[PDB]
Design a binder for this molecule. Sequence first.
Ligand SMILES: *[C@@H]1O[C@H](CO)[C@@H](O[C@@H]2O[C@H](CO)[C@@H](O[C@H]3O[C@H](CO)[C@@H](O)[C@H](O)[C@@H]3O)[C@H](O)[C@H]2NC(C)=O)[C@H](O)[C@H]1NC(C)=O
Ligand SMILES: *[C@@H]1O[C@H](CO)[C@@H](O[C@@H]2O[C@H](CO)[C@@H](O[C@H]3O[C@H](CO)[C@@H](O)[C@H](O)[C@@H]3O)[C@H](O)[C@H]2NC(C)=O)[C@H](O)[C@H]1NC(C)=O
Ligand SMILES: *[C@@H]1O[C@H](CO)[C@@H](O[C@@H]2O[C@H](CO)[C@@H](O[C@H]3O[C@H](CO)[C@@H](O)[C@H](O)[C@@H]3O)[C@H](O)[C@H]2NC(C)=O)[C@H](O)[C@H]1NC(C)=O
Ligand SMILES: *[C@@H]1O[C@H](CO)[C@@H](O[C@@H]2O[C@H](CO)[C@@H](O[C@H]3O[C@H](CO)[C@@H](O)[C@H](O)[C@@H]3O)[C@H](O)[C@H]2NC(C)=O)[C@H](O)[C@H]1NC(C)=O
Ligand SMILES: *[C@@H]1O[C@H](CO)[C@@H](O[C@@H]2O[C@H](CO)[C@@H](O[C@H]3O[C@H](CO)[C@@H](O)[C@H](O)[C@@H]3O)[C@H](O)[C@H]2NC(C)=O)[C@H](O)[C@H]1NC(C)=O
Ligand SMILES: *[C@@H]1O[C@H](CO)[C@@H](O[C@@H]2O[C@H](CO)[C@@H](O[C@H]3O[C@H](CO)[C@@H](O)[C@H](O)[C@@H]3O)[C@H](O)[C@H]2NC(C)=O)[C@H](O)[C@H]1NC(C)=O
Ligand SMILES: *[C@@H]1O[C@H](CO[C@@H]2O[C@@H](C)[C@@H](O)[C@@H](O)[C@@H]2O)[C@@H](O[C@@H]2O[C@H](CO)[C@@H](O)[C@H](O)[C@H]2NC(C)=O)[C@H](O)[C@H]1NC(C)=O
Ligand SMILES: *[C@@H]1O[C@H](CO)[C@@H](O)[C@H](O)[C@H]1NC(C)=O
Ligand SMILES: *[C@@H]1O[C@H](CO)[C@@H](O)[C@H](O)[C@H]1NC(C)=O
Lengths: 42, 339, 240, 47
Amino acid sequence: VASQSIIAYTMSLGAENSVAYSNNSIAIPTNFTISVTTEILP
Amino acid sequence: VSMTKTSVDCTMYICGDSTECSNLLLQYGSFCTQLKRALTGIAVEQDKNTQEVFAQVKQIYKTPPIKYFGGFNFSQILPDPSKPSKRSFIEDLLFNKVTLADAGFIKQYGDCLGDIAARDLICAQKFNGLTVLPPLLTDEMIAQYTSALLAGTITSGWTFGAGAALQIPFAMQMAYRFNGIGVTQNVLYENQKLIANQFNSAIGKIQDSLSSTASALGKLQDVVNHNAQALNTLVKQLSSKFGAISSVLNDILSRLDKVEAEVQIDRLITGRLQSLQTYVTQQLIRAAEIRASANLAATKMSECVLGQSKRVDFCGKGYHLMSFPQSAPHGVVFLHVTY
Amino acid sequence: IANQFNSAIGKIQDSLSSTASALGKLQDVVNHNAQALNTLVKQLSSKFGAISSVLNDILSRLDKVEAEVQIDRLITGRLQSLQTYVTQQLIRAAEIRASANLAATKMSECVLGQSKRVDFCGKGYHLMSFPQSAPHGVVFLHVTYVPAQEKNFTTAPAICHDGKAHFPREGVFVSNGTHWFVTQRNFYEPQIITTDNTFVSGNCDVVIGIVNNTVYDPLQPELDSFKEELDKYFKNHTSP
Amino acid sequence: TTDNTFVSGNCDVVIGIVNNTVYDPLQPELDSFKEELDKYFKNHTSP
Ligand SMILES: *[C@@H]1O[C@H](CO)[C@@H](O[C@@H]2O[C@H](CO)[C@@H](O[C@H]3O[C@H](CO)[C@@H](O)[C@H](O)[C@@H]3O)[C@H](O)[C@H]2NC(C)=O)[C@H](O)[C@H]1NC(C)=O
Ligand SMILES: *[C@@H]1O[C@H](CO)[C@@H](O[C@@H]2O[C@H](CO)[C@@H](O[C@H]3O[C@H](CO)[C@@H](O)[C@H](O)[C@@H]3O)[C@H](O)[C@H]2NC(C)=O)[C@H](O)[C@H]1NC(C)=O
Ligand SMILES: *[C@@H]1O[C@H](CO)[C@@H](O[C@@H]2O[C@H](CO)[C@@H](O[C@H]3O[C@H](CO)[C@@H](O)[C@H](O)[C@@H]3O)[C@H](O)[C@H]2NC(C)=O)[C@H](O)[C@H]1NC(C)=O
Ligand SMILES: *[C@@H]1O[C@H](CO)[C@@H](O[C@@H]2O[C@H](CO)[C@@H](O[C@H]3O[C@H](CO)[C@@H](O)[C@H](O)[C@@H]3O)[C@H](O)[C@H]2NC(C)=O)[C@H](O)[C@H]1NC(C)=O
Ligand SMILES: *[C@@H]1O[C@H](CO)[C@@H](O[C@@H]2O[C@H](CO)[C@@H](O[C@H]3O[C@H](CO)[C@@H](O)[C@H](O)[C@@H]3O)[C@H](O)[C@H]2NC(C)=O)[C@H](O)[C@H]1NC(C)=O
Ligand SMILES: *[C@@H]1O[C@H](CO)[C@@H](O[C@@H]2O[C@H](CO)[C@@H](O[C@H]3O[C@H](CO)[C@@H](O)[C@H](O)[C@@H]3O)[C@H](O)[C@H]2NC(C)=O)[C@H](O)[C@H]1NC(C)=O
Ligand SMILES: *[C@@H]1O[C@H](CO[C@@H]2O[C@@H](C)[C@@H](O)[C@@H](O)[C@@H]2O)[C@@H](O[C@@H]2O[C@H](CO)[C@@H](O)[C@H](O)[C@H]2NC(C)=O)[C@H](O)[C@H]1NC(C)=O
Ligand SMILES: *[C@@H]1O[C@H](CO)[C@@H](O)[C@H](O)[C@H]1NC(C)=O
Ligand SMILES: *[C@@H]1O[C@H](CO)[C@@H](O)[C@H](O)[C@H]1NC(C)=O
């Protein structure tokens, strides 16, 4: 048995993410994606 | 980036809970709803402005526990875990420079009665239906977005702006910035100790300047002062007679009957409704100036923090290397780093 | 790249066909201008303290010195209703102007050019943008290169060889853990470290974190093949 | 040097051009290989 309700919560800002930084480490992209996005202006 | 949200009980401002004043106020039709709508429009926009300036990160980025960045010392602009709100050292100066007249949080009515109404204007404002609303993002919630923009920048350069964050050593990220201003990257690596010491001392001068001087955050304090002055002005116009025998609605209703009282009450309705229409027009005009500043601050965040700018003087006086955001009450401070 | 673009344009049609309110930034302009005229025509019903709002009823029932104090109440209130509409429309007009100045700037910098401005022409590195018209507005289809499938590498700021320190001309140094390469910064494409991939400055003791590797000299193997050629001439030339 | 610079045209189209040597990094190593080539011919006088 389960049931719709109004809930209240403290909002999330995003996923948490530690960047793997080091004195001698680099990340380099091996591929790409072409992305198309709309922007709408009056 | 934003200004204090305000909501007004039009009915309570114009009529001090007089029912015969409220029945006269209905003769004017939708003007009270137009005022309420306009103020709701301004209030909803302050959250939009703040979201667009700060919420540019996909992820809440974190630095490693090893705080070494090629000799550059971000410890005064990174978040301090010892504070109950995790702001940086410099953000915790900026919050002392700008002093707010209300922030919209709970007053338990025990706060309002007795002595405090004699010494805090906020009570006169509240007792006349003028309410400051809270922002959607708390100052801790803005400090999170700011520490994520900053942690992304120092650990990954511009890469978190375009895609996923890609780590790069900070001295090599700074060498990219040197190539980007047309200085060959060996000029960084052959002078890295000097460049770090210059930067570390230049951040030291920001703390000294913010600790010593009174009015440098005047651009933010002036927003608080104008929104406070406007509400104090609006509550002053309750004292004005507008040609009635008294400004006090209860005097008229203690002394006149329900046909010659009305020509007094109608003057006060006419003048008080004009006082709100003036306030709301002034706030709609101010809100457009704050919007234009939030759009500039979001453009500065995009082009100076998430990138390196070729635009002259857009990211400070010099050739731009990088910039660091720090939050302030109703605003943002950019620390622009320039060669 | 063509298939990624063609399928990304395919998702624009599916999104616009599926979702109700993505064009809300334009529909809200229509809704505010319609709401303002409906509000302004509503204020004709308001009495403003006159005996009626219907101007002809006052003129059907009163005479030309005490009708006028009713008519003047309605003039005063209706004139205020217009003065409020026109002020609200002047303030809306200033915001639509600011949006049109931004849209004209996006047209010049994202359509008529390629923009170095971060996030100005969509989320990624800008390639190009295509304008499409809409009722009271413009839609820009921004096309952006977004990097993908990253790998970790070890890196160094410089390479040390003949006691001299070498830096990438373009690109960055990387190692897979056993060998060293130069790659371009925004796509992994590794190459042998050479005197064409690198430039020299100073010696291997000024730079923090410099690493030892050979730097290949493309002239030298063909010159030595020309030395083995010179020797094959000399050895045969012992016979005359 | 011939690596620091690029060539275009002759010395009479450009206002304010100056005379100076331009080093060619290929030439000294080729002449070190010429004196090496020459020493091989001087030794080859013996067989
Ligand atoms: C770079 O990213 C590309 C995706 O944007 C990726 O292309 C995709 O490659 C896979 C195969 O690895 C294809 O999948 C199909 O492959 C065959 C049919 O051709 C079938 O066996 C599979 O079941 C499946 O249908 C994708 O169709 C293809 N996508 C596109 C748009 O071409 C590249 O492989 C990636 N390259 C590198 C080096 O990582
Ligand atoms: C990065 O810059 C920081 C700001 O200048 C710097 O912090 C400062 O460090 C010194 C030395 O530790 C502190 O001086 C105090 O040292 C101990 C601390 O318990 C006391 O017993 C002394 O009396 C003295 O007051 C400064 O107070 C401190 N400043 C701040 C604002 O924290 C960091 O050390 C620098 N980081 C690196 C890695 O160099
Ligand atoms: C480029 O500008 C640098 C300043 O931004 C400058 O660095 C400064 O150099 C002087 C010495 O020439 C140092 O002065 C100190 O030197 C020793 C102690 O180390 C003492 O004998 C002196 O009394 C004095 O304390 C400065 O400390 C140093 N500043 C920094 C930030 O490192 C460079 O020398 C300039 N380089 C060139 C090529 O002009
Ligand atoms: C790091 O990248 C290096 C270059 O891609 C790679 O070295 C190469 O390794 C392969 C084997 O995995 C060698 O392939 C050779 O295999 C036999 C060896 O006798 C030959 O007959 C073949 O013709 C072929 O050349 C490559 O020769 C070798 N390249 C070099 C320049 O040594 C490393 O293996 C990579 N390391 C890691 C940890 O991935
Ligand atoms: C990178 O390659 C360099 C060249 O092979 C190497 O430099 C050499 O390092 C050794 C050890 O430091 C030096 O040996 C001398 O060390 C002291 C005197 O400083 C004495 O105790 C020894 O008897 C000996 O004289 C070499 O002289 C030095 N060679 C040069 C040209 O500097 C680096 O150590 C290598 N570094 C890495 C991280 O691989
Ligand atoms: C830069 O170097 C040039 C090469 O040495 C040099 O050009 C030479 O200039 C002289 C004088 O103008 C010419 O001499 C001829 O001048 C006239 C004919 O034009 C006659 O009266 C002379 O007898 C003689 O024939 C050289 O012919 C000319 N050489 C070349 C190759 O053009 C420039 O003068 C130098 N300029 C500077 C500013 O240093
Ligand atoms: C890049 O590598 C880090 C960790 O370093 C790696 O350590 C070895 C196992 C080997 O792979 C080395 O060549 C690398 O340098 C990755 O971060 C870890 O990710 C895992 C999940 O996969 C997570 O559980 C760990 O807690 C992470 N550790 C740290 C220190 O953050 C990172 O994911 C790698 N990034 C990419 C793009 O592959
Ligand atoms: C980076 O180098 C510094 C200086 O030698 C060192 O203190 C620090 O521990 C190094 N970082 C890591 C991840 O070990
Ligand atoms: C030249 O010949 C002598 C012996 O006649 C020999 O000792 C010497 O090594 C030779 N030099 C070369 C460069 O061949």
